[PDB]
């Protein structure tokens, strides 16, 4: 079978070191639309392949509501 | 001996009330740039380079 795949998977060379700067690109595009909603700011992110963090450090205390509002 | 005419009496009280008990929880603090961040003075605190 022959198979149309114009995605990125890995055992190429770049894929250790472009994949981390689609991240980069991507968790910064997605906390600039979540900060119509609330009010902070990112203290760290850190990539690694696909799977990372983001520290946000908010104004007031963090309560049970801005839990489940950020993650919806 | 019960007199029912002179053991009547009217409690006085408020209708409504709304009882809170932290009252830090309504404020919202924030921190200046801590590069800028004054002593007791005028001056800054660790500005010698």
Do not use: C, W
């Amino acid at each position: 079978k022959k198979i149309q795949y114009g995605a990125v998977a890995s055992g190429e060379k770049q894929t250790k070191a472009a994949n981390s700067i689609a991240n980069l690109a991507l968790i910064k595009t997605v906390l600039s639309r979540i900060s119509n909603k609330y009010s902070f700011a990112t203290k760290i992110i850190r990539v690694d392949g696909d799977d990372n963090y983001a520290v946000l450090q908010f104004n007031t205390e963090v309560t049970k509501q801005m839990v489940q509002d950020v993650s919806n | 001996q019960f007199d029912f005419r002179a053991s009547m009496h009217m409690l006085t009280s408020n209708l409504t009330f709304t009882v809170y008990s932290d009252l830090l929880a309504f404020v919202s603090a924030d921190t200046v740039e801590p590069i800028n961040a004054v002593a007791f003075d005028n001056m800054r605190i660790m500005n010698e380079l």
